[PDB]
Curated annotation (Swiss-Prot), chains A, B:
This is 3-dehydroquinate synthase. Its EC number is 4.2.3.4. Pathway: Metabolic intermediate biosynthesis; chorismate biosynthesis; chorismate from D-erythrose 4-phosphate and phosphoenolpyruvate: step 2/7. The gene is aroB. NAD(+) binds at residues 45, 73-78, 108-112, 132-133, 145, 154, 172-175. The lineage of its organism: Bacteria, Pseudomonadati, Pseudomonadota, Gammaproteobacteria, Thiotrichales. Keywords: Amino-acid biosynthesis, Aromatic amino acid biosynthesis, Cobalt, Cytoplasm, Lyase, Metal-binding, NAD, Nucleotide-binding, Zinc. It comes from Francisella tularensis subsp. tularensis (strain SCHU S4 / Schu 4). Gene3D superfamilies: 3.40.50.1970, Dehydroquinate synthase-like - alpha domain.
Amino acid sequence: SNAMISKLSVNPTFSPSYNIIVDSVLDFSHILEYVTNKQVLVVTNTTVAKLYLTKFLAALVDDLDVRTCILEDGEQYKSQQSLDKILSTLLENHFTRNSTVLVALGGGVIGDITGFAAAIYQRGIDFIQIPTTLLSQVDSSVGGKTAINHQLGKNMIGAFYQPKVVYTSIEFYKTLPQREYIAGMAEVVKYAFISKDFYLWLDSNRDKILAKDSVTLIEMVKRSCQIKAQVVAMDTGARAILNFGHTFGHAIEKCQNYRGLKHGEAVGVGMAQAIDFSHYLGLISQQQAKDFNDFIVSFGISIDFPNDICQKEFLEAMLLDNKELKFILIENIGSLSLQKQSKNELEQFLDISR
Amino acid sequence: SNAMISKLSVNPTFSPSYNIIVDSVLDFSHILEYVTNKQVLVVTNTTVAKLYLTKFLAALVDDLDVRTCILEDGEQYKSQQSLDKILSTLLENHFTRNSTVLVALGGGVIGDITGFAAAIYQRGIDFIQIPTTLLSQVDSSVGGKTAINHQLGKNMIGAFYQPKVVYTSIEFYKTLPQREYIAGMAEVVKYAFISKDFYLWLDSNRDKILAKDSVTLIEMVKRSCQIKAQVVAMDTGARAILNFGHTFGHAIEKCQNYRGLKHGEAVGVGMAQAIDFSHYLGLISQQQAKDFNDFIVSFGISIDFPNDICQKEFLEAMLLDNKELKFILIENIGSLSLQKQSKNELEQFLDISR
Ligand SMILES: NC(=O)c1ccc[n+]([C@@H]2O[C@H](COP(=O)([O-])OP(=O)(O)OC[C@H]3O[C@@H](n4cnc5c(N)ncnc54)[C@H](O)[C@@H]3O)[C@@H](O)[C@H]2O)c1
Ligand SMILES: NC(=O)c1ccc[n+]([C@@H]2O[C@H](COP(=O)([O-])OP(=O)(O)OC[C@H]3O[C@@H](n4cnc5c(N)ncnc54)[C@H](O)[C@@H]3O)[C@@H](O)[C@H]2O)c1
Ligand SMILES: [Cl-]
Ligand SMILES: [Cl-]
């Protein structure tokens, strides 16, 4: 009835609009409009299932044809093998193209695979997202990227597929581990470097954000989503800025074998590097770099570069992406650029690092 | 230089236009414009490879980064297993999202899997079709359907993906088995039931078509493609008519385990059934039905219903598609309709059949 909620209309230029709902309580009924008289398959992992599945099923339980596919927890399971489980469940239970809906209940991993499945099953069926991690709330909810991993590369197979609705709740943070939360906070901070307005907003509401004030967190999520929506709306060209800090981030994950820092933790460290590298190239002053890194730390995000990564391998990891060597660099808050830079510059910059 | 060719612009409403090139000679250079300075992977099966691969590679051979993936011949190989071979080849050889092109050199099976691979590899890369069968020339070249089979269902996983160009040659018929050719001719005839103009054209050029006059065959292919292009342009709603005779067709294939009649042969028999069923329902007169079936036979297509299919299983095969029981029925040449019909009607109609 009278519970703080927030809706944000996202309107893809090549698809019908949908809205991202962010609420203070956990009330899965906000999605019944897209689940009625439909064959529903919920995809989750063991953990999210343990915590939310029986509550979710209970929020429907209206004699509706509902099935579940519980994948294993982990990035390794965003695989073809898991995709086949989702696809067999759909085929074994004769889920038609017309009244089928996949519901992705979980974090980014579940969101990617479920979205991809929905994109290919009979060349596309309704897809509903329920991001249960901060990172997936502010990053998966907009853009339409869906994908799965291959032994030879992560996120190499996928599709652009929009959801019918995105329902999420700040209540999910009550069960989300501190590291996972902070990892997602790195994505939020990224939007602050993209948008000067957001930067000022976060800087003013830090106290409430850290104290987890419901009204504030809801708006924080909403504004992050608006920024990504506005960036993709520019079409994919100047959209590259969303990769601020990912070049260094992806390389950290590759060097640790994706068993060190979480994805979001790597982005945090990566942004700190893009900043320092931006200064090295003379794009920002030392003061600006100190201020920017301070800001990341300001929100509990760690910017320390992992001790177990060698310079040799780290440099090699960044060159694999002959082609040209492009980075997302900062010139000012709200001013990021896709910038081509030599291997020498990169190598010389990493010497200060060791 | 001076060789009869035919281009037909197809303009998908949700994608850039492309054109279907149909020529009298085999000259693969008509595609160099979409292969220059690109990493090229050619997908084919053992047979098409045997006959055309070394000619194809020789038509490029300009120090270009070209690779091949030779799948096994057969519908059974339009599988995830084959899709993985195409995907590993792309990843092992570091084919980027930006200068990659998949070339589907073969018939419909190769066209579907290659198109699907191109649709998902890094969420979409350039796709080029070289249909080597009559059926794939007039059916795969328009519409954008790509798919792969699953043990639990044929063409259940796929994507809508348009090509950059479609190059084909009537020269391919010189190596194409009579049955395969005739099977493709069933698809051409289908367009005659869809379009009264085409019907009249085929009826006038039968002699030349059967005698394989180059100028005539080229136009036949061109006009078939125009019809499908015009049908999909109506958007997917009234587009169902393209399934004229497929309801019965798919059922024949299911009963024979896809080891009896070829796909196109089944469509031929299927159309003959849709016609007889249309008469049974009182939509067309007996004379019309006799005329329509005569016309199919007119082009060397067989309309005999397979002797090895039991009524029991055949009826069961058609009900699997509770939902409603819809057929594409004829009311006149150029007048097909998606028509809902009872199980009783269907069963009663099949009694005349045995
Ligand atoms: N396609 C996109 O737009 C996009 C954008 C960003 C990230 N991603 C993808 O997202 C993935 C990582 O995202 P992520 O940070 O959600 O990681 P994740 O999906 O692996 O989730 C991390 C962990 O948190 C658990 N978890 C999730 N929600 C929880 C909750 N409410 N309470 C307790 N535990 C919970 C999961 O079981 C898992 O162990 C990456 O694979 C990345 O490729 C996709
Ligand atoms: N997506 C679409 O728009 C669409 C439309 C119609 C059919 N299809 C698909 O196409 C498939 C069947 O099409 P098809 O009739 O091309 O069958 P096919 O692709 O299996 O080819 C039939 C046989 O002909 C051989 N062959 C092909 N070209 C040849 C040539 N020039 N000379 C000698 N041999 C040759 C092949 O090796 C194969 O044995 C079905 O799986 C169907 O799903 C797709
Ligand atoms: Cl970067
Ligand atoms: Cl039919």
